[PDB]
Amino acid sequence: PYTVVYFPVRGRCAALRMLLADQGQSWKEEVVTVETWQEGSLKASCLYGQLPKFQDGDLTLYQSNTILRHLGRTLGLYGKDQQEAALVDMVNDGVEDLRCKYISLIYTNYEAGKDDYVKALPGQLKPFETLLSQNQGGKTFIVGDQISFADYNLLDLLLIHEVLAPGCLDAFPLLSAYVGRLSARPKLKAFLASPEYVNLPINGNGKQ
Amino acid sequence: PYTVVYFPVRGRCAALRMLLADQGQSWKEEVVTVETWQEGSLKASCLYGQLPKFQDGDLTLYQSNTILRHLGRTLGLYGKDQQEAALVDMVNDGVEDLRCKYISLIYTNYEAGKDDYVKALPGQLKPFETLLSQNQGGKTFIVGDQISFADYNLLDLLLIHEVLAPGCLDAFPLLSAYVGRLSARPKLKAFLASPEYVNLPINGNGKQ
Ligand SMILES: N[C@@H](CCC(=O)N[C@@H](CS)C(=O)NCC(=O)O)C(=O)O
Numbered sequence: 181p182y183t184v185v186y187f188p189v190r191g192r193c194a195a196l197r198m199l200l201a202d203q204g205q206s207w208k209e210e211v212v213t214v215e216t217w218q219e220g221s222l223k224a225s226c227l228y229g230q231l232p233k234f235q236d237g238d239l240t241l242y243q244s245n246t247i248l249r250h251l252g253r254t255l256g257l258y259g260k261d262q263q264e265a266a267l268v269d270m271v272n273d274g275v276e277d278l279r280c281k282y283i284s285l286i287y288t289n290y291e292a293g294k295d296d297y298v299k300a301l302p303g304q305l306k307p308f309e310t311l312l313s314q315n316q317g318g319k320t321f322i323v324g325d326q327i328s329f330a331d332y333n334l335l336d337l338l339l340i341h342e343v344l345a346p347g348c349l350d351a352f353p354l355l356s357a358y359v360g361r362l363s364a365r366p367k368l369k370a371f372l373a374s375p376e377y378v379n380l381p382i383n384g385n386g387k388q
Numbered sequence: 389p390y391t392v393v394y395f396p397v398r399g400r401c402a403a404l405r406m407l408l409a410d411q412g413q414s415w416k417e418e419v420v421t422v423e424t425w426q427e428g429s430l431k432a433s434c435l436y437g438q439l440p441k442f443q444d445g446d447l448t449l450y451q452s453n454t455i456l457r458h459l460g461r462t463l464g465l466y467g468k469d470q471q472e473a474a475l476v477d478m479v480n481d482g483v484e485d486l487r488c489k490y491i492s493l494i495y496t497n498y499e500a501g502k503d504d505y506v507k508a509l510p511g512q513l514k515p516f517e518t519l520l521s522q523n524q525g526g527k528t529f530i531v532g533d534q535i536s537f538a539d540y541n542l543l544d545l546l547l548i549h550e551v552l553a554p555g556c557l558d559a560f561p562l563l564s565a566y567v568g569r570l571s572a573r574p575k576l577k578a579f580l581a582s583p584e585y586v587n588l589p590i591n592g593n594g595k596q
Pocket residue numbers: 191192223229230231232242243244245481485
């Protein structure tokens with residue numbers, strides 16, 4: 181009953197796709213080519229003129245984080261109570277802020293700005309190590325004792341940064357074990373190894 | 389029980405303040421001076437090195453939208469069901485995207501960008517006009533028939549844009565009536581006319 185409408189890249193759909201796969205949900209991928217997009221028809225029909233577009237039986241959604249929150253809400257991946265729910269949001273918004281900077285780098289100032297970005301990276305990742313350190317010694321999830329939509333988003337964020345700056349997680353033991361632990365989850369491991377994930381570029385401009 | 393820690397500006401705390409006031413909630417304002425901020429201590433203690441910081445009892449939060457969602461969740465301003473909840477998020481994420489562009493203009497390119505921004509503005513506001521037209525003819529709220537935290541955020545977005553580009557809403561009848569209608573709510577109207585709000589600049593660099 182799920183349909184993901186996006187360009188042929190991981191980008192802003194990698195996290196939600198991981199969530200879907202890890203949660204054993206089935207969905208349809210509706211790939212939008214550059215030629216199709218430039219055609220202008222689809223874009224004009226999009227609420228904010230952008231993708232991803234998500235369909236949940238009659239319900240149509242836009243905004244990657246809205247989709248993540250929707251799935252987290254309907255699949256029970258939003259903490260045990262209101263207090264944890266606020267913590268989940270705090271983590272996701274944090275993930276979103278760094279994702280915004282990452283995207284800015286990739287598409288507008290990769291060459292001349294990568295040096296600065298990477299040098300500032302440790303300070304951008306430390307907060308997540310700290311969060312893990314204050315939650316059951318970082319042995320479970322980013323918030324509480326159950327996986328939340330924020331875990332998939334954080335996981336993706338971490339995975340794409342290791343490609344940008346290999347070894348960026350070496351100085352952070354909790355995050356490292358975290359990635360390995362979540363990446364090992366059966367369904368998720370299978371997905372991360374599949375061509376569906378592996379043969380799609382991270383971004384759409386060939387840079388990473 | 390509620391404490392807002394922020395710089396002496398409206399900025400990213402404007403919407404959450406309107407929400408709290410309109411909902412008849414009481415809170416404390418802890419002002420952080422630029423001098424204090426530059427001192428470094430407080431910043432170092434902030435999860436992501438920024439403000440606002442929000443306290444709800446012993447629950448400490450960061451991220452303006454996390455605070456809005458937390459209050460929306462605890463005060464019943466998040467839709468009547470799960471589907472409306474998703475729509476509320478979609479609206480708020482859209483507001484956040486435009487707020488981000490607005491902040492970018494105000495702080496990094498007011499002089500050279502304002503002209504373009506204003507021309508591109510209509511296309512950025514239309515999505516919200518469209519949303520209103522598909523919900524009771526735009527006579528109630530942005531989502532459903534009860535106010536949500538997204539309403540407060542959108543309202544602020546529209547108020548600051550009216551100052552940045554006087555009359556920008558003349559091209560959007562529903563958004564215009566919307567602003568007048570929400571700004572009329574008793575508790576909110578009193579708040580917007582109070583020194584607490586009026587004597588605070590919209591932004592921290594004097595531009596608007
Ligand atoms: N705030 C949105 C960002 C959407 C966005 O930036 N979409 C890009 C691709 S990642 C897009 O549609 N680009 C084509 C265009 O803007 O015409 C979200 O998180 O979903």
